[PDB]
């Protein structure tokens, strides 16, 4: 019966391929062929933040466009003030192999995690006046790749054991678990309404999940190597993916098909971080050749280059009002561009 | 305005306190050496770690030689795939690679792992300290027969022992021949690439060796010496 199951799977894959071929009416380039080019985009460094001792692995903006969180492999978590470059807090971590960090929308809690397979939560508004550990979430069998906040009481986690999870912070238990990937999940991004979320794995695939029911609705393919960056379009009906084959792609959700690809001949190194802008017209992506590129999503022609970092770029971030772009690289420096 | 300055003064004093603490932390952080331990299940990498220790998933070890502190890590709470979490250890002083020499059918896997580590994009500037374990088992294997290394490697029949060898006081020539043949196999691929950016240090060890800490100390001293030669324009 196993051979029959394989034949049935192949036949249904053929039917799916025929359906996706039927859906593809016209190319994105043909529709976006007359719009004005963005032009030359030259940003300059406005603030340089120093104080970290080792390479920076992740960062996140607060929901005020003023406060920032940075994580480095030296084992420290620094909360800055971008306007005056004043360090607001410094937190020593128990484990120095930290791979992600997050900022709660309310602004009272901060989460972190890494190779220890544990998500740690710290409280910022303690009545005493000191940051302290509030709750540790455990249950993952692999390293944490990303973590995002839904409310003050719920969190979403993606691990290297090909699984994602939803946690209720108050009781510290898993409510739902999402499975189905073959390789390690590298990143995730929450929807604007916090009802769906997408995740890309090291099997050259991406999957869309519904938070409440806990099921996989759509899976997208097209890359030929590991996907190591993902985000969400401001509209909430598309997303962008970067892989190790040195090319970016844009995927939709109601068409269930790839839309656009960004590539160049001189680019051999892959992408590490991808972030959008407020309007949805600019795509910022950092590479391993020590700089970042600013692509125009609609035209798929490079419009800007950000240079100045002396090592591999690891993290990108954009404010909620689109007034600053923060880049963190392996040279222990955070740079703000406007 | 009064509130503005009344808050800026507090912000400045807090920043000064944090900066002082950060400098104090940097002083300690800059004087500690980090090492990453790699090997296979058959290889007794833990037992040497236990020996130096006596002398969450991630095993941690701290030891001290000549008032210099060394920190060793062991990642074992993950899956077989390791092409993503190994990029974290790119600023490590040196990688301690443990190899099983007694088993022949597992030697090709160790050679392939060593070759993959050698040619990595993010591991081209990190030296590797090679520990060939299980010398007694290899000696018992070759001496008693019933197992021919020629079957696994047909280049063992046209191999002659190099002259610049230092056999132990009491030892059969065949044992020395095979033992140095394994090291020659591992060192053949270590010299094809690498423009003097890293070097492989080979050593022979057993299950009762109590001298690995000094070996690592000397190798780290040589690595730091090379880095200082490059840094101080002495080349």
């Amino acid at each position: 019966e196993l051979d029959q199951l394989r034949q049935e799977a192949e036949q249904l894959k053929n039917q799916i391929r025929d359906a996706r071929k039927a859906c593809a009416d016209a190319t994105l380039s043909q529709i976006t062929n007359n719009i004005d080019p963005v032009g030359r985009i030259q940003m300059r460094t406005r603030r340089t933040l120093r104080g970290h001792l080792a390479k920076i692995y992740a960062m996140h903006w607060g929901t005020d466009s003023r406060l920032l969180v940075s994580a480095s492999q030296d084992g420290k978590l620094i909360i800055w003030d971008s306007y005056t470059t004043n360090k607001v807090h410094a937190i020593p971590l128990r484990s120095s192999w930290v791979m992600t960090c997050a900022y709660a929308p309310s602004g009272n809690y901060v989460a972190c995690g890494g190779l220890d397979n544990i998500c740690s939560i710290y409280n910022l508004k303690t009545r005493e006046g000191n940051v302290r550990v509030s709750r540790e979430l455990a249950g993952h069998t692999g390293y944490l790749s990303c973590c995002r906040f839904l409310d003050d009481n719920q969190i979403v986690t993606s691990s290297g054991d090909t699984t994602c999870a939803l946690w209720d912070i108050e009781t510290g238990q898993q409510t739902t678990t999402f499975t189905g990937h073959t390789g390690d999940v590298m990143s995730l991004s929450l929807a604007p309404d916090t009802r769906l979320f997408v995740s890309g794995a090291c099997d050259a695939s991406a999957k869309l999940w519904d938070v409440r029911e806990g099921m996989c609705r759509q899976t997208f393919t097209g890359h030929e190597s590991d996907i190591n960056a993902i985000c969400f379009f401001p509209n909430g009906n598309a997303f962008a993916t970067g892989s190790d084959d040195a090319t970016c792609r844009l995927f939709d959700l109601r068409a269930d098909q790839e839309l656009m690809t960004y590539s160049h001949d001189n680019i051999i190194c892959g992408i590490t971080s991808v972030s959008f802008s407020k309007s949805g017209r600019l795509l910022l992506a950092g590479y391993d050749d020590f700089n970042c590129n600013v692509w125009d999503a609609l035209k798929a022609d490079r419009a800007g280059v950000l240079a100045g970092h002396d090592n591999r770029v690891s993290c990108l971030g954009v404010t909620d009002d689109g007034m600053a772009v923060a880049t963190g690289s392996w040279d222990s420096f955070l740079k703000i561009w406007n | 305005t009064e509130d503005q300055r009344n808050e800026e003064k507090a912000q400045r004093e807090a920043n000064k306190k944090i900066e002082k603490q950060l400098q104090k932390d940097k002083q300690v952080y800059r004087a500690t050496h980090r090492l990453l331990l790699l090997g296979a299940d058959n290889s007794g990498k833990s037992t040497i770690v236990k020996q130096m220790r006596i002398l969450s998933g991630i095993f941690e070890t701290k030891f001290q030689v000549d008032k210099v502190n060394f920190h060793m890590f062991d990642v074992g709470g993950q899956r077989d795939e390791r092409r993503k979490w190994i990029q974290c250890f790119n600023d490590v002083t040196a990688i301690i690679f443990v190899v099983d020499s007694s088993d022949y059918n597992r030697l090709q896997e160790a050679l392939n792992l060593f070759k993959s580590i050698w040619n990595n994009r993010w591991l081209r500037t990190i030296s590797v300290i090679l520990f060939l374990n299980k010398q007694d088992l290899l000696a018992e294997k070759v001496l008693a027969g019933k197992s021919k290394i020629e079957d696994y490697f047909p280049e063992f029949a046209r191999y002659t022992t190099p002259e610049d060898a230092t056999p132990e006081p009491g030892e059969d020539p065949r044992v020395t021949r095979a033992k140095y043949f394994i090291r020659d196999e591992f060192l053949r691929i270590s010299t094809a690439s690498g423009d003097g950016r890293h070097y492989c240090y080979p050593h022979f060890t057993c299950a009762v060796d109590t001298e690995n800490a000094r070996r690592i100390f000397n190798d780290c001293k040589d690595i730091i010496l090379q880095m200082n030669l490059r840094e101080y324009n002495l080349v």
């Epitope: 030929e224 590991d226 040195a246 | 077989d80 390791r82 993959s116 040619n119």
Partner: nanobody, 126 residues
């Protein structure tokens, strides 16, 4: 979608010959190093041979050093394994394996319990 499909196989006797062909689809064929692996009953996966992007560098294991031959064809995106003088230690499932990253001289995971880019395999018996 990445696809690597084996072919060939059959029943032979000690001292026979049979060529194995792997077809590929879904990626550029010349940027990736390729390997041959086999899995025989009672043990785990093992490595056999590898070939580079162009066709110059070639490596075997000792147990098959003087017997088998590898080849690759970029025009037809095919991987060939010539196999002769068989001995009762070759019955296994044969997977052709891709290197995860392009334009690199090394890659880590080719022989793992679960690997993304592999083939179903073919069974050959002596």
């Amino acid at each position: 979608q990445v696809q690597l499909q084996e072919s060939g196989g059959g029943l032979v006797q000690p001292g026979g010959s049979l060529r194995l062909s792997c077809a590929a689809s879904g990626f550029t064929f010349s940027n990736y190093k390729m390997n041959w692996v086999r899995q025989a009953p009672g043990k785990g996966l093992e490595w056999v041979s590898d070939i580079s992007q162009s066709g110059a560098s070639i490596s075997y294991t000792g147990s098959v050093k003087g017997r088998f031959t590898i080849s690759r064809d970029n025009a037809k995106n095919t991987l060939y394994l010539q196999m002769n003088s068989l001995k009762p230690e070759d019955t296994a499932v044969y997977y052709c394996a891709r290197c995860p990253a392009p334009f690199t001289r090394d890659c880590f995971d080719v022989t793992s319990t679960t690997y993304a880019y592999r083939g179903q395999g073919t069974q050959v018996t002596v």
